[PDB]
Amino acid sequence: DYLRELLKLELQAIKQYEKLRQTGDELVQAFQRLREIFDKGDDDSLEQVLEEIEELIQKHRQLASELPKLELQAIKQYREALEYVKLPVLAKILEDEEKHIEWLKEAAKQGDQWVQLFQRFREAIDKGDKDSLEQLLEELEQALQKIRELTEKTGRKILEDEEKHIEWLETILG
Ligand SMILES: [Zn+2]
Ligand SMILES: [Zn+2]
Structure with a gap:
């Protein structure tokens, strides 16, 4: 009954990283x-x-809010099914999912940082020019790619592990 549930969460997870x-x-x-x-x-x-x-x-940013919750969703269910079942593989998944939230919330900090900078750039056009605007766009273009660095690695890293979790679970099932 329950393994098909854990599967759905692992699918939905991928579909979220698919949309990000x-x-x-x-x-x-x-x-x-x-x-x-x-x-x-x-x-x-x-x-x-x-x-x-x-x-x-x-x-x-909407979708970036969901994933931290949806990786928690998984954790909940894996921890549940370990108090009852104690399968060796469910442990290994749990450990991945724990370290997936580590990955996320480190990069979600870098996200907040940048959302501020963009908003300051937009407010410079409202009220004169706070600096040579050239300089702030120059700063954004770089800090954009600094996020893109953390993302593509510590994003696809998960997508690898999440796909591995599905195959593991599908195996236990028929
Ligand atoms: Zn995960
Ligand atoms: Zn997973």
Whole structure:
């Protein structure tokens, strides 16, 4: 009964990292267009692209909130089924899922950091120019890729382990 449940959580997990993966691309490829429009110095076009990006963050950041909960969901059920069953493999999964939240919340800190910086950049256009705007975009473009570094590794790292968890569980089942 219960192993099919644990499976569904492990599938849903992948489907969530599947949707972040997608958002991560769009947010980066949107930032391309910002560097283009700001280089031309178009006042009208920039306003749209800034709102376009600010919206994309809310969606990405939405999903980034879910995963920490959904990896907890798993942990709950694995810990349950270890008090009763004590299978050697359910232990190994639990240990992965524990270290998956470690991975996440380290990179979710780096995410908050950057969401501030973007908002400061958007507020510099409101009230004059707080610095050469060139400098703040220059800072963002780098800190963007600093997140992208932590993401693609400590993101796909999980997707490897999560796929391994499914195969393990499917094996125990028929
Ligand atoms: Zn996990
Ligand atoms: Zn897992």
